[PDB]
């Protein structure tokens, strides 16, 4: 009846005021959440953002991460104080049909992330081991056994394995930056919140600073990682009777989550400066993983003789594909955990990790093998580009399931009927939290029309455009109705 019954309140190791060892104990949840924010689904968008705007968008990244650190912490709080995840709170404060709508929506979000990671991992196999593109996908389907071995290890080593992947993809991209020797003064100048990133005048590569900045801000959080954080935050036993120990617990999970999401921010920065210093100006013409592979393997694309010799040897591209692999291993863990959370929390369905990863992976790979089937039917022409367009088109479900995950979180944590007058949010995080939630909801509701119109490709059929407008209006209006309904129920609880 409690979230993550297998590993809920497992190891509690606060030992008086020995704070840093205590920090070493529970440092796992923050990493499990942060590794999701390093998935390849936006890697190109960073590199592109670096080529179109050298170091300019870095500050935006920071801001985004900060916002991601805020809401995530809130989620952790809901897990630590209430001893129940976000899905159990929402489902407990609304009917079953709303919990079912939220269930299918979040399932579609984690399904979208799973699509990004199966595409990135399959391509990673196509680049490293030269496995055929169609075989690499059905090889990625075999991650259920890696989940079976993953199940017997334990969170003290699983949550450290996630750290291992994090520093793998962090040191892979940091190594290519160390060889690049970039002008770190311009990097520092770019990290400052300047007003050149909010303008619309450069328009390099069909992208203005305000478009890229609002895109980075719009994709701030992932809805599934909120339920994930609220669930894994409970894995540390708390008496819930001593205010100093639960306040200490909040400091604990906060410093952990910031320590890891800061690493994710560092990875995004390494991707932007990867697009600025490593690649030449405008050298990246194919945002696909294969385009970045050949671009990292062509000496004329880099801006340094050392990177030209190393690129000719073929080490940059292989490290890139290794980073694709280490990033593609995330949904096997966080996808199954979060899927269990929303499943047994929203619809009260107890399913094993076997059929979970089976169903999610199959539903994820169906459109992938359809895309590879059509493109390979065209002669393997534009197959990687179409895989990239599938990966980017999949991210609409996140915008569909974002407000129904950030609004109920902020409401339930701001109310005293769930947190109490002692552990509710400060008047500071009320203003910042509501501002962030409003901005993200508006920006994603704007993104719905752009992505739905993007489903029809870069060929604008005049009759299909109006249909995209009708479908977009219907979707955003339906999300408005669901949003005001959830607002009404939660505000009826408070």
UniProtKB/TrEMBL annotation:
Pfam families: Nramp. It is a multi-pass membrane protein. The chain crosses the membrane at residues 53-71, 100-127, 133-151, 158-178, 259-279, 358-376, 396-413, 434-454, 466-488. GO terms for molecular function: cadmium ion transmembrane transporter activity; manganese ion transmembrane transporter activity; metal ion binding; symporter activity. Its main location: membrane. GO terms for cellular component: plasma membrane. It comes from the Bacteria. The keyword Ion transport applies. Keywords: Cell membrane, Ion transport, Membrane, Symport, Transmembrane, Transmembrane helix, Transport. One of its GO terms (biological process) is iron ion transmembrane transport. It is found in: Cell membrane; Membrane. H(+)-stimulated, divalent metal cation uptake system. Belongs to the NRAMP family. This is Divalent metal cation transporter MntH. The lineage of its organism: Bacteria, Bacillati, Bacillota, Bacilli, Lactobacillales.
């Amino acid at each position: 009846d409690l979230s993550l019954s297998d590993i809920n309140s497992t190891v509690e190791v606060p030992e008086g005021h020995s704070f840093w060892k205590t920090l070493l104990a529970y440092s796992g949840p923050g990493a499990l959440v942060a590794v999701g924010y390093m998935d390849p689904g936006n890697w190109s968008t960073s590199i592109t953002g670096g080529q179109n705007f050298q170091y300019l968008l870095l500050s935006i990244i920071v801001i985004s991460s900060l916002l991601a650190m805020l809401l995530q912490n809130m989620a952790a709080k809901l897990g630590i104080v209430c001893q129940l995840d976000l899905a159990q709170a929402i489902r407990a404060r609304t009917s079953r049909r709303l919990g079912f709508i939220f269930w299918i929506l979040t399932e579609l979000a984690i399904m979208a992330t799973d699509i990004a990671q199966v595409i990135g991992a399959a391509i990673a196999l196509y680049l490293l081991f030269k496995i055929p593109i169609f075989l690499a996908v059905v090889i990625t389907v075999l991650d259920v056994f890696l989940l079976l071995l993953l199940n017997r290890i334990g969170f003290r080593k699983i949550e450290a394995l996630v750290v291992c992947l994090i520093f793998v993809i962090l040191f892979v991209f940091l190594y290519q930056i160390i060889l690049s020797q970039p002008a770190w003064h311009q990097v520092a100048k770019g990290l400052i919140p300047s007003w050149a990133s909010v303008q619309t005048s450069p328009k390099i590569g069909g992208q203005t600073p305000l478009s890229a900045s609002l895109g980075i801000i719009g994709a701030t959080i992932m809805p599934h990682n909120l339920f994930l954080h609220s669930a894994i935050s409970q894995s540390r036993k708390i008496d819930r009777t001593d205010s100093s120990k639960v306040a200490e617990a909040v400091r604990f999970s906060n410093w952990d989550s910031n320590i890891q999401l800061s690493l994710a921010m560092v990875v995004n920065a390494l991707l932007l400066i990867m697009g600025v210093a490593v690649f030449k100006s405008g050298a990246v013409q194919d945002p696909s993983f294969f385009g970045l592979y050949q671009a990292l393997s062509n000496p004329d694309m880099v801006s340094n003789p050392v990177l030209a010799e190393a690129a000719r040897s073929g080490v940059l591209s292989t490290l890139f594909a290794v980073a694709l692999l280490a990033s593609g291993q995330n949904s096997t863990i966080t996808g199954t955990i979060t899927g269990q959370v929303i499943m047994e929390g929203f619809i009260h369905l107890r399913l094993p990790l076997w059929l979970r990863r089976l169903v999610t992976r199959l539903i994820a790979i169906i459109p992938v093998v359809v895309c590879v089937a059509i493109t390979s039917h065209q002669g393997s022409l534009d197959e990687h580009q179409a895989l990239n367009n599938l990966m980017n088109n999949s991210q609409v479900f996140l915008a569909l399931a974002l407000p129904f995950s950030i609004v109920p979180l902020l409401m339930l944590t701001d109310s005293a009927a769930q947190m109490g007058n002692q552990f509710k949010n400060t008047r500071w995080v009320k203003v910042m939290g509501w501002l962030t939630v409003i901005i993200l909801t508006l920006l994603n509701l704007i993104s719905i029309s752009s992505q739905i119109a993007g489903f029809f490709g870069d060929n604008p059929s005049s009759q299909d455009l109006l249909l995209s407008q009708v479908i977009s209006i219907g979707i955003i209006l339906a999300m408005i109705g669901l949003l005001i309904w959830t607002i009404i129920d939660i505000r009826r609880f408070t």
